[PDB]
Amino acid sequence: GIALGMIETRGLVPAIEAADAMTKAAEVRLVGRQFVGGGYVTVLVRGETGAVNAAVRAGADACERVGDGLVAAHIIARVHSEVENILPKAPQ
Amino acid sequence: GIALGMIETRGLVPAIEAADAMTKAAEVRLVGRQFVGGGYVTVLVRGETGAVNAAVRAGADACERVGDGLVAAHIIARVHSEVENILPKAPQ
Amino acid sequence: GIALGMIETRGLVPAIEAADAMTKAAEVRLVGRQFVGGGYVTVLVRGETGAVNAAVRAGADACERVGDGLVAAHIIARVHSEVENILPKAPQ
Amino acid sequence: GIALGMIETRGLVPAIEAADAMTKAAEVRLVGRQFVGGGYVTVLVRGETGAVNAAVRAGADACERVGDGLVAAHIIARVHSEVENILPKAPQ
Amino acid sequence: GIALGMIETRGLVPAIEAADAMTKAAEVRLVGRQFVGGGYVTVLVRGETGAVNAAVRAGADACERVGDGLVAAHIIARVHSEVENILPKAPQ
Amino acid sequence: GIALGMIETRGLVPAIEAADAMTKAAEVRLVGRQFVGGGYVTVLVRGETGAVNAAVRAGADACERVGDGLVAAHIIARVHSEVENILPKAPQ
Amino acid sequence: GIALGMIETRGLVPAIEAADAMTKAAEVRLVGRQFVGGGYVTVLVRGETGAVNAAVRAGADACERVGDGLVAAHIIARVHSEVENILPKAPQ
Amino acid sequence: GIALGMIETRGLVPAIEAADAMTKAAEVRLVGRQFVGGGYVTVLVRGETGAVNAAVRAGADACERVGDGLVAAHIIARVHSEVENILPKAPQ
Amino acid sequence: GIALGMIETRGLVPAIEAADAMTKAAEVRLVGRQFVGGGYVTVLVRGETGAVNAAVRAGADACERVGDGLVAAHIIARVHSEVENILPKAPQ
Amino acid sequence: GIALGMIETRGLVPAIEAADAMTKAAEVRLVGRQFVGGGYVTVLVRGETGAVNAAVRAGADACERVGDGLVAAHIIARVHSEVENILPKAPQ
Amino acid sequence: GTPEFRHAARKPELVCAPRSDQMDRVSGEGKERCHITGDDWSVNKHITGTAGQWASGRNPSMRGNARVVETSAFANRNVPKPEKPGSKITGSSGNDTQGSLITYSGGARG
Amino acid sequence: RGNARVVETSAFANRNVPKPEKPGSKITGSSGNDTQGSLITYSGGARG
Amino acid sequence: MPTDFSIQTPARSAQNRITGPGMLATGLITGTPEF
Amino acid sequence: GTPEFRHAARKPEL
Amino acid sequence: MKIMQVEKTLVSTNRIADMGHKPLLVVWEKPGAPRQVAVDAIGCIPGDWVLCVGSSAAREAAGSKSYPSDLTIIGIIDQWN
Amino acid sequence: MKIMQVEKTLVSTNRIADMGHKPLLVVWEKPGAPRQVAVDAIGCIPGDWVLCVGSSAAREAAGSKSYPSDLTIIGIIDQWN
C-alpha cells in the first residue's frame, strides 16, 4: 500500500491512542511519529487505501476525547511523488 | 507486562509527581519521559494490565493539583507491535 | 522555476495536504517543509510564476479545512539570490 | 559594513517575505535565519548603516500583513564585539 | 478493481473538474464520459473500493461549485456482470 | 422469462444504480439502456415474472434518492408481441 | 502548456464569442468544442497556466453579455493523464 | 469572406427566417446551421464586414417575432485563426 | 515571454522607479524605455503572463506618488503579430 | 556605489544646479543627464545609500526655487541589473 | 533603533474567504477566495487591459427576448401527475404501500 | 518585571482557533458514510 | 513658489467620438441598415 | 411571414 | 457478524409486505455449508465474501426496527481468501 | 460471552454508515474454529484471548444502543491458556 493516513493531536497521549487504534483497526504500517512543535504530535500510517481509510476513521474516534483532543485525521489514497520526500519511512 | 500507562501533564513537576505515584502504587516500570513541546510532558509506564490500571489511577490523582496539572491519563491493555517502535524502551 | 510559493499551516497534517494539493495542481517542486515551532509548519514549492500561483491557490483551498488550518499563502515570483541561502533546496 | 537589521515575524512565510524585501531593497547581506521557538522567526541582515535602514523598512512594510505578521523590525548601527558571538555569520 | 464511481454534473466543465479530482485523488481509472442529454454529463471511474470512495469524495467536493454543479456522486463497491455491458470500457 | 421490468431515472447515475440493484436483486437480464432525451435514461430487464417483480421493486428503492431521482418503475408480466418490436434485445 | 480552461455557455453563439475572445486575449490553442446538450456548449483552451487564467477571465467577461451566457469558467493547470483522454486534445 | 455573423434562435423555424432575411439582405454565405441542443439553432454567415453587419441586423429583426424568438445576434469582424477550426465551412 | 506590460509616466524619474519595481517583482524583461515626447516615458516589459501581472502591479504602486506620477499601467497577455512590429525588442 | 539618486527638474538650469549640489554634498558620481521631452531633464547620481540620501536632499534644496523647479527627488538603494540598461553609464 | 527612535526615547479571520459567502468568477486555479499574498497574478483596478472592456467590447452583440420553457427530466420533476395508484389486493403479495411507486400494467400499484 | 505578556502559539492556544466551514458528504452508495463521528478528511478537505 | 511648466503648450492646452465619412449625411440616406 | 405580418413588421393540466 | 459468501439471489413473491422492496441473497459460510438468506442492504454480486449481522441489529441494518430479517449484509469484505 | 482469540483485522469499505468508525476483528474459539467478526470496542492486538458478547448487548457494548452489531469485544482476558 502507498496510501497515507495521518492523525494529528494536541499532545502525545492522544497520538499514541490514535497510532494504536489505527494499527489495530486495519493492516497499516506506522511509518512515523512527529513532534510538530506547540504540542502538535502527528502519527502517519501507510497501507492499502481501504485499510488506511479504516485505520484513520478508527484512530480519530479513539483519540477524540482522549487528552486535549484530535486536530486532524486525513487520508491521501494516491500521494504525489514530491510529497513522499517529506514523509518518514520508519518511525524513530 | 505489555500494558502502557501514559500521564500527560502541563510541565515536568506534575509529570515527576505522576511518575513517582505510578511507580510506588503498582509494579509498573517507568519506560520514558517525553518533552512534546508547548509544555506537555508524557510519563509512560509498562506492566501487566491491573498494575497499569492502579498506577495510572494513583498518578492521575497525584499530578492533578501539582502545577499546571494533568492533560491526560490513559491505559492501553495490549499495545500493537507497531506502536512499540514509537515507545521509549528505557527512560532518559 | 525560480518563483517560490509558501503555505504556512498550524500543524503538519494541513501542510502535507497543502504539499500534495500544490504538487498535484501544478508542475511545482516541493523544496521543503520547515517546523517553525509553535506548531507552525511552512511548505515551500518552486516553479514558474503561473504554476506557483495555481499551486498555492490549490494548496490553500485544500488545507483551509484540514486541521488547525492555513496561516499564510504567499508567492515570491522572483527571489533575491541572498534568500536562496535561507530557502531549503530539497525536501529531507 | 557592520550595521545589523533584524526583522522578527510570527512564522517563516512572513520572514522569507521580509528577507527578500530587505535584500532587494538595499545593498545588505542576509546573515542568518533563527527559529527562536513559539512561532517566532528572526531574519538578520548586515551592511552599511543606510543600506540597513532602507532594508529594515522595506522588509517591515513587505511582511507587515503577510502571515501572522511582524513582531519586531530594529536597526543597530554598530554592535558590541561581545554581541558578535550571539550573532550568526552566515545563514544555514 | 471492479468498483464504480459515477459523478453526474450539469454541464461538462464540472464533469472534467470532477474527473481530474477523482483521478488525482486515488488510483482509479477514468473509464468514460457520457452525455446523457438535458446537460447531464456522467464521469465514471473504476478501481478497488477504497480508492473509488476517496476519489468520489474528492470529485464531489471539486465539481460542486464549478458551473451548474453536481447532480449525483455515487460509489458501487462490486458491480454486477450484467451492469458491466452498459458501462464504457474506455473513455472517448 | 419474457416479463419486462423497466426503471426510468432523471439521469444515468440513478439508472446504473437501478440496473445494478435489479440485476443483483433477482435473476433478470439487463437487455437495454436508453437515453430517451432530456436526461431521461431507462434501464430494461427481462426475466421470469416473479424475478422481474423482485428486481424492479429493489431497483426503484435503490435509485429513489440517488441523483435527481426515479421517474418510473413498471413491471409487464405478459408483454404483447407488437411491443417486443420496440424493445431492445441486448444492451449497447 | 498543459493548463486547461473550459468555458461553458448556453448556446453556440456565446461559446464562439468566448473562444474568440480567449484566443485573442492570451496565448492559448483552441483544443475543442463539445456540444454538451441541454444546449450547454463547452469551449476548451489549453495553454500556459497564467495564460489560460487570463484567457478564461477575458472570455468570461465577453461571453456573459451575449446570449444566455456563462454557465462556468474553470482552469485546471495540471490535467491528469486519464482526463486527457476525455477532453478533446485533438484540435478538431 | 472574413466576418462571421451568427443568429441564435429557440427553434429551427425562427432560424430559417433569419438565414433567409440575412442572405437576402447582403452578400453573405450561409456557412452553417447547427442544432446546439435544447432547441437552440445557430445560423452562421461569412462575408465582408459591411455585408455581415447589414445581414445580421436583417436576421435579428426578422426572427424576433417568429416562433419562440431570437437568443442572440453577434458579428465577429475577424475570428482568430484558431476559432476557424470550430467554425463550419459549408452547411449540412 | 509574450505578455507585455506597459507603465507610462510623466518623466524619466517615475519610469525608472516603475522599471525597478517591475523587474524586481517578477521575471520580466525591460524590452524598451521610450521617450514619447511631452514628458511621457513608457516602460515596456515582456515576460510570462503571471510574471507580467505581478510586475505591472508592483510598478504601478511604486511610481504612483514618485515625480509627476503614473499615467497608465496596462497588460496585453498577447498582442496581435502586427502590434509586435511597433514594439521595442531591446532597451536603448 | 549601487544606489541611484535622481532629480527631475523643469529645465536644464535647475538640473545643472542640482547636479552641482548633489556631487558637492556627498560621495556620489554623476552618471548621466537625460533630456526627457516636454522640458523635463533628469540628473542621475550613483553612490552608497547614505552618500545618495544626502546628495538628493542637498540637490532638491538647490533647485527647488531655481528656474521652473524640481519635479521628483527619488532614491533607489539597490538597482535591479535589468534597470541598468535604461540607465546612463558613468562616462555621461 | 533608528536615530530618531533613540532620540525620541529621550485583517480577515481566515486566509480563505467563506465558501458559502463567495462564488468565484473562474473556478479551479482561477479561484480568488484564498488571499495569496506576494507577487500573484492578480491585477488592481489601476491596471487596464486583457479582460473587462478589452475582451467584452471587441465584437457587437444583441441579446434577444426569447427565454423559454426547458423540456427536460429536471424541468418535469414537478410536473402535475395523476392520482397515485393504490392496492386493495389481499393475501401474501409483498404488498408494501410505503416504498417507491412500482406500477404494473394499467398503472396498478405493484 | 517588564510589560510583555504575549499570545501563546501552541496546540492548546489553537484549540479554539476560528476554523473554515466543516466538510460535508453528498456521496451515496455503501461507503461507510458516517456523518456523526470525528471529522476524517480526504484530499482537498472532503469529509471521509 | 514656481509650480508649473510656464511654457504654454498646444498639446497640453487640452488634457496635458469617431469621425468618419460614415458620419456625413446620415439622416438623408434611406437604405439597408446595420447594427 | 404573412404578407400582412411582414408588411406590418416594416386547457386541462392532465 | 459472520463471513458468508453470496451464492445466488432468492425470490419470494408471497413475502410479507413488511419486508418492503429489499433484495434477498442466499449465503453460506463456505461452499457446502448450510444456506442462509440475508437482506442485501449493500449491493452484493454473487461470489462476494460479505459481512452478515445477526439478531436485532439486522432489522435496523436494512429498513427500520420494524423491518423483519434476522440476517443482513452490512458490507462486502475488501479482500477475503 | 464467548472466549475467542483475535486472528487478524477485517476491512469493509462498503460497510453501512451505521457501523460508524469502529474497528472489526476476525476472531475464532480456537485456531481452526469458524471465524466470526466482532466490533473491537476495546483495543485488541492479534493473538489476544478476548471476551465477545451477544447481539443486543453487543450494540450497547459497541457504543450505541441502536448500533448494528451482534458481536463485540468487551474485554481482553488478563491471562488465558
mmCIF file of C-alpha atoms in Angstrom, chain A residues 12 16 30-36 41-44 88-92, chain B residues 34-35 82-89, chain C residues 33 35:
data_model
loop_
_atom_site.group_PDB
_atom_site.id
_atom_site.type_symbol
_atom_site.label_atom_id
_atom_site.label_comp_id
_atom_site.label_asym_id
_atom_site.label_seq_id
_atom_site.Cartn_x
_atom_site.Cartn_y
_atom_site.Cartn_z
ATOM 1 C CA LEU A 12 1.443 12.612 22.606
ATOM 2 C CA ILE A 16 -0.312 7.036 20.918
ATOM 3 C CA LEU A 30 3.033 3.105 11.452
ATOM 4 C CA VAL A 31 5.732 4.868 9.462
ATOM 5 C CA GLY A 32 6.359 7.921 11.628
ATOM 6 C CA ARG A 33 5.557 9.969 14.701
ATOM 7 C CA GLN A 34 6.422 13.736 14.679
ATOM 8 C CA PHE A 35 6.600 16.434 17.391
ATOM 9 C CA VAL A 36 5.489 19.333 15.137
ATOM 10 C CA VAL A 41 2.060 15.439 17.508
ATOM 11 C CA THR A 42 1.271 13.652 14.156
ATOM 12 C CA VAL A 43 1.129 9.857 13.690
ATOM 13 C CA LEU A 44 1.403 8.741 9.987
ATOM 14 C CA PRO A 88 9.094 9.451 7.064
ATOM 15 C CA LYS A 89 9.837 5.868 6.083
ATOM 16 C CA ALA A 90 10.291 4.290 9.531
ATOM 17 C CA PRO A 91 9.474 5.658 12.991
ATOM 18 C CA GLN A 92 12.083 6.789 15.492
ATOM 19 C CA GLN B 34 8.918 12.795 26.726
ATOM 20 C CA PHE B 35 9.014 16.572 26.223
ATOM 21 C CA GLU B 82 3.801 -1.311 15.568
ATOM 22 C CA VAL B 83 3.141 1.185 18.442
ATOM 23 C CA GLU B 84 6.094 -0.444 20.219
ATOM 24 C CA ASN B 85 8.546 1.340 17.825
ATOM 25 C CA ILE B 86 7.217 4.861 18.800
ATOM 26 C CA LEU B 87 7.621 3.981 22.527
ATOM 27 C CA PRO B 88 10.782 4.596 24.578
ATOM 28 C CA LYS B 89 12.337 1.341 25.750
ATOM 29 C CA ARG C 33 8.736 21.506 4.969
ATOM 30 C CA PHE C 35 8.882 23.081 11.570
#
